[PDB]
Ligand binder design. Structure first.
Ligand SMILES: [Mg+2]
Ligand SMILES: [Mg+2]
Ligand SMILES: [Mg+2]
Ligand SMILES: [Mg+2]
Ligand SMILES: [Mg+2]
Ligand SMILES: [Mg+2]
Ligand SMILES: [Mg+2]
Ligand SMILES: [Mg+2]
Ligand SMILES: [Mg+2]
Ligand SMILES: [Mg+2]
Ligand SMILES: [Mg+2]
Ligand SMILES: [Mg+2]
Ligand SMILES: [Mg+2]
Ligand SMILES: [Mg+2]
Ligand SMILES: [Mg+2]
Ligand SMILES: [Mg+2]
Ligand SMILES: [Mg+2]
Ligand SMILES: [Mg+2]
Ligand SMILES: [Mg+2]
Ligand SMILES: [Mg+2]
Ligand SMILES: [Mg+2]
Ligand SMILES: [Mg+2]
Ligand SMILES: [Mg+2]
Ligand SMILES: [Mg+2]
Ligand SMILES: [Mg+2]
Ligand SMILES: [Mg+2]
Ligand SMILES: [Mg+2]
Ligand SMILES: [Mg+2]
Ligand SMILES: [Mg+2]
Ligand SMILES: [Mg+2]
Ligand SMILES: [Mg+2]
Ligand SMILES: [Mg+2]
Ligand SMILES: [Mg+2]
Ligand SMILES: [Mg+2]
Ligand SMILES: [Mg+2]
Ligand SMILES: [Mg+2]
Ligand SMILES: [Mg+2]
Ligand SMILES: [Mg+2]
Ligand SMILES: [Mg+2]
Ligand SMILES: [Mg+2]
Ligand SMILES: [Mg+2]
Ligand SMILES: [Mg+2]
Ligand SMILES: [Mg+2]
Ligand SMILES: [Mg+2]
Ligand SMILES: [Mg+2]
Ligand SMILES: [Mg+2]
Ligand SMILES: [Mg+2]
Ligand SMILES: [Mg+2]
Ligand SMILES: [Mg+2]
Ligand SMILES: [Mg+2]
Ligand SMILES: [Mg+2]
Ligand SMILES: [Mg+2]
Ligand SMILES: [Mg+2]
Ligand SMILES: [Mg+2]
Ligand SMILES: [Mg+2]
Ligand SMILES: [Mg+2]
Ligand SMILES: [Mg+2]
Ligand SMILES: [Mg+2]
Ligand SMILES: [Mg+2]
Ligand SMILES: [Mg+2]
Ligand SMILES: [Mg+2]
Ligand SMILES: [Mg+2]
Ligand SMILES: [Mg+2]
Ligand SMILES: [Mg+2]
Ligand SMILES: [Mg+2]
Ligand SMILES: [Mg+2]
Ligand SMILES: [Mg+2]
Ligand SMILES: [Mg+2]
Ligand SMILES: [Mg+2]
Ligand SMILES: [Mg+2]
Ligand SMILES: [Mg+2]
Ligand SMILES: [Mg+2]
Ligand SMILES: [Mg+2]
Ligand SMILES: [Mg+2]
Ligand SMILES: [Mg+2]
Ligand SMILES: [Mg+2]
Ligand SMILES: [Mg+2]
Ligand SMILES: [Mg+2]
Ligand SMILES: [Mg+2]
Ligand SMILES: [Mg+2]
Ligand SMILES: [Mg+2]
Ligand SMILES: [Mg+2]
Ligand SMILES: [Mg+2]
Ligand SMILES: [Mg+2]
Ligand SMILES: [Mg+2]
Ligand SMILES: [Mg+2]
Ligand SMILES: [Mg+2]
Ligand SMILES: [Mg+2]
Ligand SMILES: [Mg+2]
Ligand SMILES: [Mg+2]
Ligand SMILES: [Mg+2]
Ligand SMILES: [Mg+2]
Ligand SMILES: [Mg+2]
Ligand SMILES: [Mg+2]
Ligand SMILES: [Mg+2]
Ligand SMILES: [Mg+2]
Ligand SMILES: [Mg+2]
Ligand SMILES: [Mg+2]
Ligand SMILES: [Mg+2]
Ligand SMILES: [Mg+2]
Ligand SMILES: [Mg+2]
Ligand SMILES: [Mg+2]
Ligand SMILES: [Mg+2]
Ligand SMILES: [Mg+2]
Ligand SMILES: [Mg+2]
Ligand SMILES: [Mg+2]
Ligand SMILES: [Mg+2]
Ligand SMILES: [Mg+2]
Ligand SMILES: [Mg+2]
Ligand SMILES: [Mg+2]
Ligand SMILES: [Mg+2]
Ligand SMILES: [Mg+2]
Ligand SMILES: [Mg+2]
Ligand SMILES: [Mg+2]
Ligand SMILES: [Mg+2]
Ligand SMILES: [Mg+2]
Ligand SMILES: [Mg+2]
Ligand SMILES: [Mg+2]
Ligand SMILES: [Mg+2]
Ligand SMILES: [Mg+2]
Ligand SMILES: [Mg+2]
Ligand SMILES: [Mg+2]
Ligand SMILES: [Mg+2]
Ligand SMILES: [Mg+2]
Ligand SMILES: [Mg+2]
Ligand SMILES: [Mg+2]
Ligand SMILES: [Mg+2]
Ligand SMILES: [Mg+2]
Ligand SMILES: [Mg+2]
Ligand SMILES: [Mg+2]
Ligand SMILES: [Mg+2]
Ligand SMILES: [Mg+2]
Ligand SMILES: [Mg+2]
Lengths: 138, 124
RNA sequence: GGCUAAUCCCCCAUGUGGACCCGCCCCUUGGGGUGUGUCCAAAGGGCUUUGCCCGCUUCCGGAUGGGCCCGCGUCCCAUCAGCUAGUUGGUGGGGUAAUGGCCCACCAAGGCGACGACGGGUAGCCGGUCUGAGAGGAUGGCCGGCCACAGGGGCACUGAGACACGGGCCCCACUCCUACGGGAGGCAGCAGUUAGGAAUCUUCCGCAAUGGGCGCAAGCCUGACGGAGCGACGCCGCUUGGAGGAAGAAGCCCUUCGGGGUGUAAACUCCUGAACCCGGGACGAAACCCCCGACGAGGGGACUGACGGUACCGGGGUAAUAGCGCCGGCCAACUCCGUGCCAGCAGCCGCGGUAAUACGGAGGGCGCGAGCGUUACCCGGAUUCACUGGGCGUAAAGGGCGUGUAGGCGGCCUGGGGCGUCCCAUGUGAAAGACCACGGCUCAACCGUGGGGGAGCGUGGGAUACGCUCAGGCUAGACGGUGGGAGAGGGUGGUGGAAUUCCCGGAGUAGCGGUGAAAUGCGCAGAUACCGGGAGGAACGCCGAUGGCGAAGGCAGCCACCUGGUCCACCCGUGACGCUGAGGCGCGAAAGCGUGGGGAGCAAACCGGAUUAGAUACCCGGGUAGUCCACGCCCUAAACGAUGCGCGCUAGGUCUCUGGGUCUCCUGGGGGCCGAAGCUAACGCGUUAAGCGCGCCGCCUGGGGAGUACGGCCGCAAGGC
RNA sequence: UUCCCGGGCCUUGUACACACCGCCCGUCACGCCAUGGGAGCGGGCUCUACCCGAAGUCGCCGGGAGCCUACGGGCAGGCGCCGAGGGUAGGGCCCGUGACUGGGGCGAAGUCGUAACAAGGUAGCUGUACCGGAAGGUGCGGCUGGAUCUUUCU
């Protein structure tokens, strides 16, 4: 049993990208899907699809990288530099609308889960709601 | 420590210990000389440093430096304790204030008068 | 003892109404209505006395101000862990404005506590204030709000209200008065005295203003207050001049004797005019009151000052205080002389023993300037208690190991509720302060008017992703079933051979033994070496590994029995049953303790021999506890991977133990070695993580003092925590 | 080429870096400072048990034993509970001084040891135990945080 499936998914993505994998399988759930959809729309991942591994649901996530680089270490820039759980089981952070944080001066995102659904920071402000602060990504 | 651990226990505020129980809280303290003598400083230096044993208005007994060139303090004189140490001496935690009570300000000192407690000289 | 009035006290009456018992109705805690019975009122004074004023009585409501009650928030020590007898509850009663163990009677046996009760220490709390990027830390003077106390302690009376600072009773301490019986006092009010202390003001003016008490008013009272005084204690404004003035006086300092510096600085020239004199001179003041009107509304009119002859305005008018710290780095400012580990400096590192930008003076310089330094204390920096925002292989820091209690945390799908969470509205968040705007004193400090913000909490409405919860469902976690394994895992009993020692016998002499060399020691009572036989105890060669098992400590001959853990295949069963784990409980090398055994070898202590300057030591000869078994304690360790447990994720290569497979190889589970990414102070770690993440526990916070002291718990003691 | 003296290069350990003519530990003595135990004694608090108990409120009596009366009762006064505070007895805790005593910390820098750091000259460390006045030594077991006869000191 994963103790925090969301943190687990984010971490899988992190590890995956850090070795420049083309894709990564996370065990599937609705909530994970919503978080993904947000990433995909934001451009951090190419996309994701549903797939059955050992006849079990998984979300396969297609990662995204930079162009090849020059000099020593040709390895390309990451599209996801930073992916981090904020609210965790055992400390759950919830923010009001006035408290939804601007991430990397706007270049990043924060993902919130709200009673309007899973939004980004901008989405939540424009919708005027707060909620649980899920993760930072930039 | 895990968050639950801080909820259970929590960080501990660090108490501060007074380097100077001249105390009764005070900035200065009146006292009476018991001994007036000299002492030999710590390892790297050599000199005869001038100090006094003082009984205090705080009912305390302490060694005090007698800063200056010359010093008039005698056995039974009354004196004002400043506080602050002399680093190369032993357990001298306080200085005597020049210019007040029986400790007169340093004879013929032109430059830093306030420390050493001497008034302004005369001009021709 | 006697006289006497009243708005003083009391009795009958009138009952608008009201209070009480009982009944009824509506509301629902003792709220409101109603009926019968009962019970309860009043005070008079002034006037221009025919009408009005000031009052009085009962009732209902208003307003203001309080009492009591609840949720939540409110410092340190667990070396304070158990506390409690009106204690916890009940029935009845007493008491109060009123609930209430607030108090008493009787009954029940309860109440509180690791979510920290009880105990000890400290402390008035807050709006705010200081600091801080913030979070936070620290504080609560002044001003506003609340509490509490009035020399210490108890108590009540009077009243709407007090258990009453300038009221009362009692006790205690203290000061005084005393005819020795006895009395009087209460500045933590203003001012003042004294003691203590580093330190904190005038025995001022005034009732003019605002406010308060009484009075119909006139008016009286007000050390509240409005002022003035003293202290650079703080903040703010202001001054000690302004312009001209040398290819650059003197003096003083440096000098490479050429010169360089103080420096336009001065002198001097001119100009302005702080102080100061003269003149004028306030605002704060309009009501109370007078007139008309009806003592109203309205309109009109006059008295009224501490500050003060102050501020201010006009005229006149003198170049007219500067100091304090620093100048080695941090840190802005350098030279000369004097001193020679002295005298001294010092916040830290450090400077001074003959060139001292560090001591002392001087010149010069930097910084502030009516101030400048110092000491003390708070925040800061310090991310150095780390929520923001730290750690633990070797720097401090993983608990010896486990089992599990409380607690913390929790896979996938669906539905209900909406407690957390979020949103809107709304009430509250006083004033002051902070912020913003505009304004008032010439400015500012200071002050006014206005606007905004604001966590938190109350009420109402809404949202449902996440967390919670309830109901249902799934199988990927977890456990089970079946069938295979490998194993020094544990307990019990038995048994085997090598060797040592000892005893018996044979044979057999002169030494053996031991060391660097020796000696003690053993041998003619026949040793050593050799052979045969016996007794006993302890440990298991080869196999044996760089191997295996266990949670750790730890486990090695062979056999049997009892028994724990674990791995793989099948994918068969249950359906989240999970992870962690403060306490608790159990295990826990060696040594050690107790009672009994056992005793071959080894062997602390010990007895000897050498070596050595000496020996207690290193080497040699003996040797007791002990080492071994039973049982009961002890609970430490480099108990080490110096690396807590679990889960998921992130290249490979290679050797190996053990399963499965179509067995080159692949697929599990172990042990190792190199190494991706990555990490790390480095060394190193690297699918057996010291990488990336999540959950929970333990632990750290400079070195010593010190795993010490005191306390407590445990222990037979040693000693442990 | 083993040895003695001097030297060169590579490697290893090091707590040395004035650099082994080094460093540190420790004992006895000498100077100060803080502290522990502590007989006995001085004062304080607190609890429990019992005795005394002011004021006052409340309760009872208030009687041919007092005062008033409209005969309904009122006051004085007595008694009781409670009760500040005092005493006695013991229990516990906190300061004060303290004979005697244990280490500890420094300090000019003396004394004699040579344990540790190089395989520190017997590898070290360690829990426990015995021995020594102590440094230490030895036993047993553990750790690697170990290097490839004796015989000093600077
Ligand atoms: Mg790929
Ligand atoms: Mg909120
Ligand atoms: Mg004292
Ligand atoms: Mg009379
Ligand atoms: Mg009379
Ligand atoms: Mg009469
Ligand atoms: Mg009356
Ligand atoms: Mg009547
Ligand atoms: Mg009626
Ligand atoms: Mg009211
Ligand atoms: Mg203690
Ligand atoms: Mg009682
Ligand atoms: Mg009353
Ligand atoms: Mg009752
Ligand atoms: Mg609780
Ligand atoms: Mg107090
Ligand atoms: Mg601020
Ligand atoms: Mg506070
Ligand atoms: Mg106040
Ligand atoms: Mg009192
Ligand atoms: Mg009194
Ligand atoms: Mg009192
Ligand atoms: Mg009172
Ligand atoms: Mg008074
Ligand atoms: Mg004095
Ligand atoms: Mg004053
Ligand atoms: Mg007045
Ligand atoms: Mg008035
Ligand atoms: Mg009136
Ligand atoms: Mg005043
Ligand atoms: Mg000029
Ligand atoms: Mg010149
Ligand atoms: Mg003129
Ligand atoms: Mg006026
Ligand atoms: Mg006026
Ligand atoms: Mg008229
Ligand atoms: Mg009028
Ligand atoms: Mg003028
Ligand atoms: Mg003029
Ligand atoms: Mg002049
Ligand atoms: Mg500088
Ligand atoms: Mg100086
Ligand atoms: Mg000289
Ligand atoms: Mg010189
Ligand atoms: Mg020099
Ligand atoms: Mg100088
Ligand atoms: Mg200096
Ligand atoms: Mg100088
Ligand atoms: Mg100067
Ligand atoms: Mg000023
Ligand atoms: Mg901090
Ligand atoms: Mg900070
Ligand atoms: Mg600290
Ligand atoms: Mg943190
Ligand atoms: Mg915070
Ligand atoms: Mg740290
Ligand atoms: Mg461990
Ligand atoms: Mg549980
Ligand atoms: Mg969940
Ligand atoms: Mg809700
Ligand atoms: Mg609001
Ligand atoms: Mg406000
Ligand atoms: Mg305002
Ligand atoms: Mg602030
Ligand atoms: Mg203005
Ligand atoms: Mg203001
Ligand atoms: Mg609501
Ligand atoms: Mg719904
Ligand atoms: Mg739901
Ligand atoms: Mg739960
Ligand atoms: Mg279910
Ligand atoms: Mg099986
Ligand atoms: Mg076995
Ligand atoms: Mg066995
Ligand atoms: Mg045999
Ligand atoms: Mg024989
Ligand atoms: Mg024979
Ligand atoms: Mg013989
Ligand atoms: Mg012989
Ligand atoms: Mg034989
Ligand atoms: Mg025998
Ligand atoms: Mg072997
Ligand atoms: Mg081992
Ligand atoms: Mg078995
Ligand atoms: Mg088995
Ligand atoms: Mg199945
Ligand atoms: Mg089923
Ligand atoms: Mg566990
Ligand atoms: Mg446990
Ligand atoms: Mg044991
Ligand atoms: Mg043993
Ligand atoms: Mg024994
Ligand atoms: Mg032997
Ligand atoms: Mg010998
Ligand atoms: Mg021996
Ligand atoms: Mg460590
Ligand atoms: Mg340890
Ligand atoms: Mg950890
Ligand atoms: Mg491998
Ligand atoms: Mg096979
Ligand atoms: Mg493996
Ligand atoms: Mg690398
Ligand atoms: Mg590196
Ligand atoms: Mg490696
Ligand atoms: Mg792995
Ligand atoms: Mg893996
Ligand atoms: Mg891991
Ligand atoms: Mg590390
Ligand atoms: Mg310390
Ligand atoms: Mg110990
Ligand atoms: Mg005992
Ligand atoms: Mg011990
Ligand atoms: Mg040589
Ligand atoms: Mg060469
Ligand atoms: Mg070289
Ligand atoms: Mg070498
Ligand atoms: Mg080494
Ligand atoms: Mg050194
Ligand atoms: Mg040296
Ligand atoms: Mg009594
Ligand atoms: Mg009476
Ligand atoms: Mg009594
Ligand atoms: Mg002593
Ligand atoms: Mg040695
Ligand atoms: Mg040794
Ligand atoms: Mg050695
Ligand atoms: Mg030992
Ligand atoms: Mg001994
Ligand atoms: Mg020995
Ligand atoms: Mg050993
Ligand atoms: Mg170490
Ligand atoms: Mg070692
Ligand atoms: Mg020798």
């Amino acid at each position: 049993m994963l103790t925090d499936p969301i943190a687990d998914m984010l971490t899988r993505i992190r590890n995956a990208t850090r070795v420049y994998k083309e894709s990564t399988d996370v065990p599937a759930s609705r909530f994970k899907e919503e978080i993904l959809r947000i990433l995909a729309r934001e451009g951090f991942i190419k996309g994701y699809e549903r797939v059955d591994v050992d006849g079990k649901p998984y979300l396969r996530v297609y990662l995204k990288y930079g162009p090849r680089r020059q000099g020593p270490d040709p390895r390309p820039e990451q599209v996801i530099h930073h992916i981090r759980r904020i609210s965790k089981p055992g400390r759950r952070v919830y923010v009001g609308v006035k408290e939804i944080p601007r991430v990397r001066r706007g270049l990043g995102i924060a993902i919130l889960s709200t009673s309007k659904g899973v939004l980004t920071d901008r989405e939540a402000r424009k919708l005027g709601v707060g909620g649980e602060l899920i993760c930072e990504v930039w | 420590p895990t968050i639950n651990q801080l909820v259970r226990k929590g960080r501990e505020k660090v108490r501060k210990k007074s380097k100077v129980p001249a105390l009764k809280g005070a900035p200065f303290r009146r006292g009476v000389c018991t001994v007036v003598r000299t002492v030999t400083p710590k390892k790297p230096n050599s000199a005869l440093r001038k100090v006094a044993k003082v009984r205090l208005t705080s009912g305390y007994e302490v060694t005090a430096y007698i800063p200056g060139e010359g010093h008039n303090l005698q056995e039974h004189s009354v004196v004002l304790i400043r506080g602050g140490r002399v680093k190369d001496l032993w357990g001298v935690r306080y200085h005597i204030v020049r210019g007040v009570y029986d400790a007169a300000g340093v004879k013929d000192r032109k430059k830093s008068r306030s420390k050493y407690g001497t008034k302004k000289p005369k001009e021709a």
